[PDB]
Design a protein around this motif. Structure first.
Motif, short mmCIF file in Angstrom:
data_model
loop_
_atom_site.label_atom_id
_atom_site.label_comp_id
_atom_site.label_asym_id
_atom_site.label_seq_id
_atom_site.Cartn_x
_atom_site.Cartn_y
_atom_site.Cartn_z
N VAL B 199 51.23 45.15 35.61
CA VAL B 199 50.34 45.20 34.72
C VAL B 199 49.37 44.32 34.98
CG1 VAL B 199 51.95 44.44 33.22
CG2 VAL B 199 50.83 42.42 34.49
N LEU B 200 48.05 44.94 34.67
CA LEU B 200 46.50 44.32 35.26
C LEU B 200 45.61 44.27 34.18
CD1 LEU B 200 47.18 46.97 37.49
CD2 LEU B 200 44.88 47.21 38.39
N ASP B 201 45.01 43.31 34.60
CA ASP B 201 43.96 42.68 33.53
C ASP B 201 42.67 42.64 34.21
OD1 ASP B 201 46.26 41.80 31.72
OD2 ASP B 201 46.22 40.12 32.62
N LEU B 202 41.61 43.86 33.93
CA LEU B 202 40.34 43.67 34.06
C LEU B 202 39.46 43.11 33.80
CD1 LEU B 202 39.89 45.02 36.61
CD2 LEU B 202 42.80 45.21 36.04
N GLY B 203 39.46 42.60 32.30
CA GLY B 203 38.83 42.19 31.28
C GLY B 203 37.44 41.13 31.58
N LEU B 204 38.06 39.97 33.28
CA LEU B 204 37.27 39.16 33.60
C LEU B 204 36.07 39.75 35.24
CD1 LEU B 204 39.31 37.87 31.29
CD2 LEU B 204 38.17 35.89 33.01
N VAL B 205 36.14 40.55 35.07
CA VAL B 205 36.66 41.64 37.09
C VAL B 205 35.25 41.19 36.82
CG1 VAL B 205 36.83 44.10 36.55
CG2 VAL B 205 36.26 42.75 38.50
N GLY B 206 34.65 40.81 38.07
CA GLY B 206 32.61 40.07 37.77
C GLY B 206 32.56 39.38 37.20
N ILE B 207 32.89 38.24 36.39
CA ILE B 207 32.84 37.04 35.44
C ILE B 207 33.40 35.65 35.69
CG2 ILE B 207 32.98 36.46 33.55
CD1 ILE B 207 33.19 39.94 33.45
N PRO B 208 32.35 34.88 36.25
CA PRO B 208 33.10 33.90 36.64
C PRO B 208 34.21 32.72 35.97
CG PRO B 208 30.83 32.74 36.29
CD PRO B 208 31.40 35.00 36.05
N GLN B 209 35.14 32.29 36.02
CA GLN B 209 36.02 31.53 34.62
C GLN B 209 35.05 30.51 35.05
OE1 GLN B 209 37.43 34.30 35.17
NE2 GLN B 209 39.61 32.98 34.76
N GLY B 210 34.07 29.70 35.58
CA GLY B 210 33.92 28.33 34.63
C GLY B 210 33.61 28.44 33.86
#
Lengths: 107, 336, 336, 304, 107, 107
Positions: B199-210
């Motif tokens: 499974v892949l979750d690409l909804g947060l690529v390029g966005i920092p987690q902070g």
């Protein structure tokens, strides 16, 4: 008298400036009224030597002094000749007290 | 972009994920115990399997391979080119780009801005403590339960012995005193029908987690530090990184084994927002569970796109009958 | 320059891949277990097969045989002359050149500059840890399941007993006390049709694994360390080393067996960039998978061209209908 | 000079390759299972055939019988004149010659030079580890597909039509496996340990050792059977270097495969010339027609 | 006592300066309740002897001292001389004292 | 007694020198659960005796003492009288009791 080193080792996993707080092992030392559970508490205490080894230099202080081999070959004949639990309590409680103190473990 | 693919595949004559026999001539494949009902009480069975660390590692490898061809392939770690599994070690307080630039391990926003592999697969520097949860999650490759309960035996290990024959410059076999590096080197091989649920979750690529979401005036927006074109490039590379998985580019000993690979069946759900995880194909009865979950998700109001291969998946549910694996990637990437 | 070839080849009355038998009169072929559908639940069946390590071994020997003829063929280790698959031992701290020179086992750039065989096949020096992935990968040769589902038995083994006769100068057979080197020499033969899926990756040859691509001014170019003429010569040698592959030069004990060989069917794809691995000829329905995996590859936009032999593969795909395997080699070398 | 010969021969009333049976009264010819499509699903049938071991041994005996004529036959193993299939013993560490000299089993460049059978047919040394691959490879003489698919029975037990695909890679003879090629100054040359004339003589001897092959001198129990031998068709390729192996005669559509491989092999740019007998091989290719056996080997040794 | 040598061997695969770090065997033998599991765990730890033998010379360390035979005849009757698990546990776990200490293994 | 010989043979299978290592047979014997698995493991272990006999003189080591038929014919009824696996498991480890002994196989 081969007791100071094992007490120091028990302290090293109870003392401050570390991350590993196991009061269960020293408690098992204290409330172990028979030979086999004394031994098992000793095993649980000594199981964490490599953690101390690879944790000591993280803050830079000298590594802890694990009890010497002779410290180990003393304990077996110290405990085997113990027949009644009456004096079996003395050694266990003594080395339990040796765990808690306020010496400089490592600067 | 939360995509879920799961299905059944067949692997034959493969030495993938070999335990090595504890460093000796006899090298053996890792085994895992699984529980099966057998309609008479659940019983355990020891069967070879492939762990998901392998899957994540070659997912990283495929992502690097399909990202270096893109014009924005500069933003990669120097160790990523040589397919280094590790991201950060104990004593590295700084990182080196492919071109040799020095990078600090503070303010992870710039780290994901200038590193792309760490953004998608996560990273952790113990000295600095900067963390990132991997945006791709790997499922273990276990043989299907029905197949295991249908064989009642046949451990699926052949233990084929294959040695190395070397002679000196005169052509002598030699003995133990001279060594000659002559060993036995027996290796056991596996075959069967496995299931996968990568499974892949690409909804947060390029966005920092902070700070995943920024507010200007009481309004949410994604916090993308990089230019959006790089975001599409990374998303496309990640989506197409699964191409060398359903073809036979998975597992170790790819040189001598090259496992016989094919897809028996597969089911994909793409959607746009968060969706329930697609159940694993290890269970013999995952198909009706899959159709029920997708039908109920559509009932709730989830705009999910369903693709099927070698699965009927009912008739009422609007599903696109795909033709292969790569054109399925094309279907995933037209809607980006 | 990635070569993907697979298909069926018929091998009858053959003893490829002997197990050895532990140095006794009974020597047999290695056997493996493979799962087959049989339309009534997957079942495991045992059958003699072929390990791919000797496929790599004899692709290596074909490489050296067809490349020493080139003027640039001086660049070999002494071991390649003896057709030995071993590359470096534990105690081998240096390599001896074919002309008598000496080279070290550091600075992999040099190791791939003056050595070509280890460059195209990988190597390992355990003392220093130099590593190179093999540029060629080998598939296992298995009997096509469409024929196991039809034999319904027919173990494939004959085990014909032929003994060696030995007499002294007086023409006496002798007995066990005199020895006479009289041993039974019993060996078994196999027959049927198998599948081959040997795969070649020539795009990374001549490139150090540590630094595959370098940046002069924020632009990528391959780290070519040698003259491109040697590069091209290695490419031709590797591609035309396939001649003693589909001619009857696979297996073991060619001196006494020399199995009958013919190419039943083959399919090849080359392209220029990374492409998925092609499906094996093991499976009965591989043709549909092949046509799908090439037509969709063309659909996504890969400059992939396909060569076919003994299958039409439809009419909507531009497939070159080749006639044999060596003219196929000419077609592949047409592009370089 | 990697030569390949393959063809179809009619064998009538042959009892070759007896199974032995442990010395009992009942002895039967061996059976091998071969698969045939028959257009209704591949099926395996048991047929009598000739294994490669005794074919290679017959090549041994023909070579040694027709090699004694040349004056260079002094360097010959005494086990070869007795026509023995065994080359070296299980515990034999030294080799003796017909004259009576002793040869050690070290420095393979000497084993290849002072031995005859070892040079041409390889050798195995269990103790010292010396080993050489045999330069002659023999296939299996299997019944042809058409005869089996049309016979619809008739277990015979034999007779019928069989095929052979004998192959001789003798281009490496006289050159030790240890150092096949030597580099003087960036120039490859073949490390021929013997003087070139002996290498030539070995070449002609190996090429014309094919006489007791198609003359009805193959198999066992020839002292009482003597099967009717008649060559039906054959095809041979000579070339100069590594070339694809010629296909065996078991399959029916072999003419097309042979003509295709010959034509496109010439297309690659190799000096390919083909000898044919009872096979058309098309008309556009240069195929030399030969109606017998003696002139075939005579032309084979023409350019040595 | 035939315990010291077996403890040496068990610690040879847990101690520092070796790259093999897998203390599953000592944990398994420590948690021993019946006759068979202690024996199979001990021999599971035992089968790694050739790894130690072939890896000792890599770092220049002296080869590990494989347990002497008399130790492995002596272990058996000392286990079959008892029936109650209460006595079983002491001899099942007594081999774990030596697994963790601070001697010198690679001079 | 009645166990030393089979253990010595199994040690002859795998030991120092004698470069023929097969841990699969002994591992399967150790983990065998039913009588059929134990019998097939014993058969596989005994199948390699001619190889050991041939390799005995290949290095000058003394020939291995082949186990007598008395031992196996006794095992035939010593295994075939049980009803539960719990009682055979230790037999297996007894069969493995000498798998990694410090035997003077080639003094």
């Amino acid at each position: 008298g081969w007791i100071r080193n094992i007490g120091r080792y028990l302290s090293y996993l109870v003392d401050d400036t570390f991350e590993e707080y196991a009061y269960d092992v020293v408690d098992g030392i204290a409330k172990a009224r028979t030979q086999e559970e004394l031994l098992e508490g000793v095993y649980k205490a000594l199981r964490l030597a490599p953690k101390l080894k690879k944790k000591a230099e993280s803050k830079g202080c000298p590594p802890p002094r694990i009890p010497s081999p002779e410290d180990i070959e003393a304990l077996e004949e110290k405990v085997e000749q113990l027949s009644n639990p009456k004096d079996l309590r003395k050694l266990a409680v003594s080395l339990a007290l040796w765990a808690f103190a306020s010496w400089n473990n490592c600067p | 972009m939360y995509v879920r693919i799961s299905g059944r595949i067949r692997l034959n004559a493969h030495s993938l994920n070999a335990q090595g026999g504890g460093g000796t001539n006899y090298i053996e494949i890792t085994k895992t115990k699984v529980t099966v009902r057998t309609e008479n009480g659940w019983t355990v069975v020891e069967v070879p399997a492939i762990t998901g660390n392998m899957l994540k590692h070659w997912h990283f490898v495929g992502f690097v391979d399909y990202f270096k061809t893109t014009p924005y392939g500069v933003n990669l770690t120097e160790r990523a080119l040589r397919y280094n599994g590790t991201r950060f070690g104990q004593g590295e307080t700084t990182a080196t780009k492919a071109n040799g630039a020095t990078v600090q391990l503070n303010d992870e926003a710039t780290i994901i801005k200038e590193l792309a592999d760490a953004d998608v697969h996560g990273f952790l520097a113990p000295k600095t403590g900067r963390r990132r949860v991997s945006l791709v999650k790997a499922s273990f490759i276990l043989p299907t339960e029905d197949f295991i309960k249908e064989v009642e035996g046949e451990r699926l290990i052949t233990a084929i012995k294959h040695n190395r024959v070397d002679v000196d410059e005169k052509g002598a076999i030699g003995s133990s005193k001279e060594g000659t590096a002559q060993m036995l080197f027996s290796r056991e091989y596996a075959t069967g029908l496995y299931g996968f649920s990568i499974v892949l979750d690409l909804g947060l690529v390029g966005i920092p987690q902070g700070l995943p979401v920024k507010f200007e005036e009481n309004q949410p927006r994604p916090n993308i530090v990089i230019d959006p074109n790089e975001r599409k490039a990374r998303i496309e590379s990640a989506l197409k990184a699964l191409i060398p998985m359903l073809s036979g580019y998975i597992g170790a000993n790819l040189a001598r084994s090259f496992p016989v690979f094919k897809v028996e069946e597969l089911v994909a759900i793409a959607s746009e927002g968060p969706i329930p995880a697609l159940v694993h194909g290890f269970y013999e009865d995952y198909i009706e569970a899959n159709r029920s979950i997708i039908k109920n998700a559509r009932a709730l109001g989830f705009n999910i796109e369903v693709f099927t291969y070698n699965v009927d998946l009912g008739e009422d549910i609007e599903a696109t009958k795909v033709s292969s694996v790569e054109e399925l990637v094309a279907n995933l990437v037209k809607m980006v």
